[PDB]
């Protein structure tokens, strides 16, 4: 209870600064006019673009990752007007989890959705036009023009789409006597940037510098077309950027269309841009607008903490540190051997290394004999696409397999796409629908804690747990809360159906060894006594579309099971509670990996969450029209009807089985400024969470970690990121000692935090 | 062969519904009772099966596992020219490693084979005519009735 105290009393100065930062009116002339964004649309190339200042404010919340910086965000949300966003979908869901654990937070989306990022922008040439900054000292106008030229192929499209959409909106209400506060409510589906000027971007170090200006730019857009009351009040955006500046980095990928060499360079993140740019540190006044959270809560060690301090603050590496980290070094052939460290996540510094490691363990488990099962993943290229693109690349000679030499990464979610063991691509022309299709096999493991990568639609088919676990679900109605408060009737219908379907399970437990004849006699006798105040008999299920029905018909079934669970719980003591209770709406038989959910009826249709830790179960086919929302896309929809698409089944933390949909992703990049839908990749998009790259590890914390370090490529920032993903130093093993080997340390942002920790106007929260 | 959902309203007991979960062969014994009642004892559990040499299959498809073979089989039933094996999984084809001898010749030594339990024996007709036509399947022409008569002595 005393843990929150420091945050509780130190976030108040933060709150008492963001308020004046958000309630500061700009001069009339400094407000970006609508005509500005009209001219931006007219401009074709980002060269004649006029030097235009877009005013903004910042407030920086830095601090160790997992330093509980979210308490500050929590206090901000419940006190201030704010639009909470996230740099990654995982981070956005993590903030939602930690904001709805205290009060109500509206669905937290990504900043990309907030400024209008759509599908076609994903693969867009974001680094093309040049800029010779008339700078040193770099004017803010020049920096903003650089960040708009960087994102010309995104800023221009956003401006054009927003502008050419037409005017009503707030313009209408404002003239009530010529009430815009009640305008976003009455006029719905309006962009969330029209109702607040405090934009919280969490884990903002995962965003490049180009985005910062972009966000501000977009803010003004969405407040100019709609003529928001904030625009009439001459308010300016304030970007509360929350993230770890020394545990997070942003990378830019460019693909050269002749060499087929996809390159990824390092970039300046928003945090580093704001901390280390003399122009932004003055305009935004970071000295009076910086909060550093300094405590590592999860950590409960002492020497582990000192090492984190020296690595994060750039302190000199001493002999004692070398001797401490010496106790973690385990051989190269010990980490890579799958027989060792079971259940420990293994980090490598190369995607090829992860592709090697995942394959060897697959062989190990398969030979030793979970189940190493094989599941189809396909691809769909088209003849016209690879005809025209080959024409435009100045090289019309290129084989399709050579097309898939590197664009397989750039055809779907990169993370799992380049970190999966898979077969040989069977690229066969299926031009029936004018197409050429590929076919490989992404072997998984059976019954492992896998994670959903992309956005999937979960369809819960039932619960495979214990009688006690299902009694708990009904008692607290936790399941109902996961579906949201606006549509509770749908959640109550399916639970009702389950209870009327799971009555047979009690009768199987009736056949349990070690029970007296009269013990079972009293069992069935109390079953009869409860039927007297209720045997399945012939209960009439179902209800009309009425709110009262799901609070009367369900109320009976909820009380029926609750009682029934608790009834036999007392009769058989702990044995009944631990007994496995499986409830499904259909005859579900699961021999080996293959499952069979018969014919679905879409009793409860929901959306799987990426953060939710699921468990791989098996690939039932049971073609559901719920996932078959297929409408190019129809040409492959016909083939998906042809070849039965397998729907992989996952088990959530509670234990409810959920059948999910597949994933489809486009590749559109070109060089002739002709973005055309080339290839759509149909696969599963699940990750093992057992092996990954250090760079991706930055995003999410891990329980047990074994780090495989490649010598020569040793960057102390990578070592710090890898070693900081786990709370306890006890469960940490490593290839070599990053402190004892030659390491390229880049301690430039470290001294900047140190000078920030050495400034009277910077607020440090313990 | 009967399809589970086609017989979902049948309300059968255990062993008589899980055998036909995807589709399952049922050995129906037709006959009379001594009092003249026409009976049809629907026998369950009988599966058609064949053998392939263990080393030969291990080589020609690196089937480093009995189930790795089942995957190659279902991959073939997916590539099937016309969509007769929809949904087929790695569990319709249970297999084990048996220690049998080819009847041909006396010098023959008892090798290691895989005994591959098909269900729905028309899939065995495919997996016998189209699966790796350079490996030698042994008893893939023996229908499920003969497996029923022979496997049960008497």
């Amino acid at each position: 209870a005393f843990l929150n105290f420091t945050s509780m009393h130190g976030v108040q100065p933060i709150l008492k600064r963001i308020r004046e930062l958000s309630q500061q009116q700009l001069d009339g002339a400094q407000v970006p006019h609508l005509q500005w964004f009209r001219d931006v649309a007219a401009l074709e190339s980002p060269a004649g673009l006029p030097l235009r200042e877009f005013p903004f404010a910042v407030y920086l919340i830095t601090g160790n990752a997992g330093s509980g910086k979210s308490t500050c965000v929590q206090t901000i949300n419940e006190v201030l007007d704010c639009v909470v966003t996230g740099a990654t979908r995982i981070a956005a869901q993590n903030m939602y989890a930690k904001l709805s654990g205290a009060f109500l937070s509206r669905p937290i989306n990504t900043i990309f959705h907030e400024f209008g990022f759509r599908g076609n922008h994903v693969q867009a040439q974001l680094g093309q036009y040049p800029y010779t900054l008339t700078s040193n000292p770099a004017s803010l106008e020049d920096l903003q023009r650089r960040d708009l030229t960087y994102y010309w192929e995104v800023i221009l499209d956003l401006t054009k789409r927003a502008l050419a959409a037409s005017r009503n909106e707030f313009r209408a209400l404002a003239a009530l006597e010529r009430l815009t506060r009640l305008a976003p409510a009455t006029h719905g589906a309006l962009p969330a940037f029209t109702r607040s000027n405090v934009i919280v971007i969490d884990e903002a170090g995962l965003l490049g510098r180009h985005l910062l200006t972009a966000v501000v730019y977009c803010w003004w857009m969405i407040n100019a077309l709609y003529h928001t009351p904030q625009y009439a009040a001459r308010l300016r955006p304030v970007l509360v950027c929350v993230g770890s500046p020394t545990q997070t980095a942003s990378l830019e990928s460019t693909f050269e269309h002749q060499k087929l060499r996809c390159s990824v360079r390092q970039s300046e993140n928003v945090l580093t841009y704001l901390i280390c740019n003399r122009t932004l540190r003055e305009y935004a006044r970071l000295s009076y607008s910086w909060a550093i959270f300094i405590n590592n809560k999860r950590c409960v060690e002492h020497e582990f903490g000192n090492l984190m301090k020296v690595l994060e603050y750039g302190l000199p590496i001493t002999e004692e540190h070398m001797q401490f980290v010496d106790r973690f070094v385990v051989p190269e052939n010990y980490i890579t051997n799958p027989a060792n460290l079971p259940g420990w996540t293994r980090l490598f510094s190369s995607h090829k290394e992860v592709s090697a490691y995942m394959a060897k363990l697959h062989a190990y488990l398969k030979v030793t004999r979970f189940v190493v099962f094989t599941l189809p993943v396909l691809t769909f290229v088209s003849v016209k696409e690879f005809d025209e693109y080959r024409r435009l690349t100045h090289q019309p000679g290129l084989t399709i397999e050579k097309w898939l030499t590197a664009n397989a990464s750039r055809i779907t979610n990169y993370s799992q796409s380049q970190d999966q063991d898979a077969g040989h691509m069977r690229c066969e022309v299926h031009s029936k629908q004018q197409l050429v299709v590929a076919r490989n096999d992404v072997t998984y493991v059976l019954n492992s804690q896998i994670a959903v990568t992309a956005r999937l639609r979960k369809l819960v088919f039932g619960f495979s747990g214990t009688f006690r676990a299902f009694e708990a679900v009904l008692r607290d109605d936790s399941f109902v809360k996961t579906q949201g408060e606006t549509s509770v009737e749908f959640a109550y219908r399916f639970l009702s159906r389950l209870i009327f379907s799971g009555l047979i399970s009690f009768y199987n437990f009736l056949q349990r060894p070690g029970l007296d004849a009269t013990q079972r006699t009293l069992a069935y006798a109390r079953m009869g006594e409860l039927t007297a105040e209720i045997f399945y008999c012939h209960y009439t299920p179902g209800e009309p579309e009425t709110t009262a029905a799901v609070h009367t018909q369900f109320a009976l079934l909820k009380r029926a099971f609750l009682g029934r669970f608790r009834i036999l719980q007392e009769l058989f003591g702990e044995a009944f509670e631990v007994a496995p209770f499986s409830t499904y709406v259909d005859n579900v038989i699961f021999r080996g990996c293959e499952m069979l959910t018969g014919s679905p009826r879409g009793g409860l249709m929901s959306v799987a969450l990426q953060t939710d830790n699921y468990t791989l179960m098996g690939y039932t086919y049971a073609r559901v029209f719920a996932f078959a929302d297929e409408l190019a896309t129809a040409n492959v929809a016909e083939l998906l009807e042809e070849a039965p698409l397998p729907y992989v089944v996952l088990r959530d933390q509670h234990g409810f089985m959920s059948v999910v949909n597949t994933n489809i992703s486009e590749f559109v990049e070109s060089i002739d400024s002709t973005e055309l839908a080339m290839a759509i990749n149909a696969d599963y998009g699940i990750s093992s969470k057992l092996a990954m790259t250090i760079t991706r590890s930055q995003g999410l914390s891990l329980d047990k970690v074994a780090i495989c370090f490649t010598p020569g490529n040793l960057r102390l920032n990578s070592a710090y990121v890898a070693m900081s993903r786990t709370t306890s130093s006890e469960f940490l093993r490593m290839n070599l000692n990053p402190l004892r080997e030659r390491h390229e340390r880049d301690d430039v942002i470290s001294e900047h935090i140190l000078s920030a920790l050495r400034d009277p106007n910077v607020v440090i929260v313990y | 062969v009967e399809h589970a959902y086609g017989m979902r309203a049948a309300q059968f007991h255990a062993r008589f519904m899980d055998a036909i979960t995807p589709t399952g062969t049922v050995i129906t014994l037709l006959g009379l009772t001594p009092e003249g009642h026409r009976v049809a004892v629907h026998v369950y559990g009988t599966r058609q099966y064949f053998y392939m040499n263990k080393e030969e299959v291990d080589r020609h498809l690196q089937c480093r596992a009995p189930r790795d073979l089942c995957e190659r089989m279902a991959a073939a039933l997916r590539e099937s020219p016309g969509a007769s094996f929809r949904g087929i999984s790695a569990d319709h084809f249970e297999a084990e490693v048996v220690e049998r001898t080819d009847v041909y010749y006396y010098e023959t030594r008892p090798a290691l084979f895989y005994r591959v339990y098909v269900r729905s024996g028309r899939v065995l007709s495919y997996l016998c005519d189209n699966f790796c036509p350079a490996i030698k399947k042994y008893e893939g022409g023996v229908d499920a009735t003969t497996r029923f008569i022979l496997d049960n002595p008497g």
Partner: peptide
């Protein structure tokens, strides 16, 4: 495996007819 019988095959012979092809 979950099986609840409370959650069959069609006869493909003429049990009824109301129209046919009168040849005689």
């Amino acid at each position: 495996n979950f099986y609840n019988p409370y959650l069959t095959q069609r006869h493909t012979y003429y049990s009824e007819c109301d129209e046919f092809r009168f040849i005689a």
